[PDB]
Amino acid sequence: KKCKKVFKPEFVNRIDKIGVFEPLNKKNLHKIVALRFKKLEKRLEEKNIQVSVSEKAIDY
Amino acid sequence: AVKDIKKLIEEGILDYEDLTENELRKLAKPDDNFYELSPYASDEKDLSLNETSGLTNEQLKNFLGQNGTYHMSYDSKSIDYAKQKKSEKKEDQQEDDDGFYDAYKQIKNSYDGIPNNFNHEAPQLIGNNYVFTSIYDTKENLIKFLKKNSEYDLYD
Amino acid sequence: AVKDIKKLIEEGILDYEDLTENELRKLAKPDDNFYELSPYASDEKDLSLNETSGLTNEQLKNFLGQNGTYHMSYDSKSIDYAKQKKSEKKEDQQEDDDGFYDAYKQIKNSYDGIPNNFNHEAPQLIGNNYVFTSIYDTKENLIKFLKKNSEYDLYD
């Protein structure tokens, strides 16, 4: 309906598929925040501080 | 024969005619989505409430009470104000559907005891018993059964 | 057994059942944050005061007092004027939470004797004794104890 309102809805005929994102759940936030700590060790292997994240550090 | 069993089999196998009084009343009982806690109702244009309404003036009600040779029978101050606003907003693009779709959804819910934004189960007295109907679970086959069979019959 | 001692141990060790009358009344006494001087209260939308309110007209109260065949029971002059302002401000982005999120907090504070922006301790009569509750220190375990045990019992 908002695609009918702002866009003059021909975009619905143009676009193959419209996706709608759910907001992040806390089950999502377990693994998703953990991915930054995998890339954290790529920039900081020169520094060679390997930060370990327990599950207690997740919910804080 | 229990409540979720009837929703699959009675469309295929079981007729409503062979069901006991303790089985008919529990299918009209509310489901387990009832007593489940649900906040955040979704607001829509309430066709129930009239924003163009006004108060009984009591000098119109006196003058219209004395019947004879009057030419307009309402106030028309708040309902023209309402029409002037729709001429000035320039809102057309979905309001061309809002007056023309959305009442059917809320008008049919008025025949089921369900108000405007009510996504849950609402009762409906059929004979001497209440039937809780939904937006989704209309329970139309129970309504056709309880009106036709229990017109001169009583099954609680 | 003193006041700060009870907040740590009675969650772990001590039950409320073994406490004297001079110990129960002092835990219901206000804390040392009370009698501490605090200016600058934080203003919020007061759900207590109704900006759309009006005065008793006394010709409506007379006409609605004579019961029968009237169709609207209030004035609606002001309340349409208020709804028009919300249509014209175009303030949506957090007001979609302000009517919906901020409000549950002030409604729960009404069950504790606490008004809208009151970040301090407010009393609540339970039986024959007052219990000063807070936004933060709800003191819910004292309330469950004084209602259940001291229903037919008296402990000052």
Q: Which residue has the tokens 């693009």?
A: B93
Nearest one of C75, A7, C109, A5 to B95, comparing CA atoms: A5
Determine the distance in angstroms separating the CA of B134 from the nearest CA of chain C, rounded to an integer. Answer: 25
Element at B125 (helix H, strand E): strand B125-126
Whole-number CA gyration radius for chain C: 23
Which distant-in-sequence residues (6+ apart) come within 8 Å of A1 by Cβ?
B94
Which distant-in-sequence residues (6+ apart) come within 8 Å of B31 by Cβ?
B3, B121, B132, B137
Query: Could you say which of C72, C74, C80 has the minimum Cβ distance to residue B51?
Result: C80
Tokens encoding C111: 């069950």
Cα(B111)–Cα(B131) distance, integer angstroms? 13
Angle at C3 between CA C2 and CA C8, to 5 degrees: 95
Interface of C to B at Cβ within 8 Å reads 60, 63, 70-72, 74-76, 80, 83, 100
Residue B133: DSSP 8-state: B
Element at B126 (helix H, strand E): strand B125-126
Q: How long a stretch of residues is chain B?
A: 156
Instruction: List beta partners, residue C125.
Output: C130
Query: Could you say which of C63, C76, C83 has the minimum Cβ distance to residue B54?
Result: C76
Nearest one of B118, B145, B148, B152 to B27, comparing CA atoms: B145
Determine the distance in angstroms separating the CA of A9 from the nearest CA of chain B, rounded to an integer. Answer: 10
Cα(A11)–Cα(A50) distance, integer angstroms? 48
Whether the Cβ atoms of residue B120 and residue B34 lie closer than 8 Å to each other: yes
Determine the distance in angstroms separating the CA of B55 from the nearest CA of chain C, rounded to an integer. Answer: 6
Cα(C12)–Cα(C27) distance, integer angstroms? 17
Whether the Cβ atoms of residue B24 and residue B127 lie closer than 8 Å to each other: no
Nearest one of C128, C138, C132 to C28, comparing CA atoms: C132
Which distant-in-sequence residues (6+ apart) come within 8 Å of B114 by Cβ?
B122, B133, B134, B135
Count Cα neighbours of C25 within 13 Å in the Cβ-side half-sphere: 8
Nearest one of B96, B111, B109, B120 to B42, comparing CA atoms: B120
Q: Which chain A residues are closer than 8 Å to B93 by Cβ? A: 4-5
Q: Write a three-state SS string for chain C.
A: CCHHHHHHHCCCCCCCCCCCHHHHHHHHCCCCCCCCCCCCCCCCCCCCCCCCCCCCCCCHHHHHHCCCCCCCCCCCHHHHHHHHHHHHCCCCCCHHHHHHHHHHHHHHHCCCCCCCCCCCCECCEECCEECCECCCCCCHHHHHHHHHCCCCCCCC
Element at B4 (helix H, strand E): helix B3-9
Count Cα neighbours of C30 within 13 Å in the Cβ-side half-sphere: 12
Residue B94: DSSP 8-state: T
Report the interhelical angle of B21-28 vs B140-148 (nearest 10°). 140
Whether the Cβ atoms of residue B118 and residue B141 lie closer than 8 Å to each other: no
* Sign of the dihedral defined by the CA atoms of residues C38, C39, C45, C50, in that order: positive
Task: Note the Cα C5 to chain centre separation in Å.
Answer: 28
Element at A35 (helix H, strand E): helix A26-43
- Tell if the CB–CB gap between C76 and B53 is shorter than 8 Å: yes
Q: Is B93 on the interface with A (CB under 8 A)?
A: yes
Report the interhelical angle of C21-28 vs C140-148 (nearest 10°). 140
Q: Which chain C residues are closer than 8 Å to B51 by Cβ? A: 80, 83
Q: Which residue has the tokens 């409430």?
A: B49
Q: Which chain B residues are closer than 8 Å to C78 by Cβ? A: none
Element at B147 (helix H, strand E): helix B140-148
Tokens encoding C153: 């019992």
Tokens encoding B138: 């209309």
Instruction: List beta partners, residue C129.
Output: C126
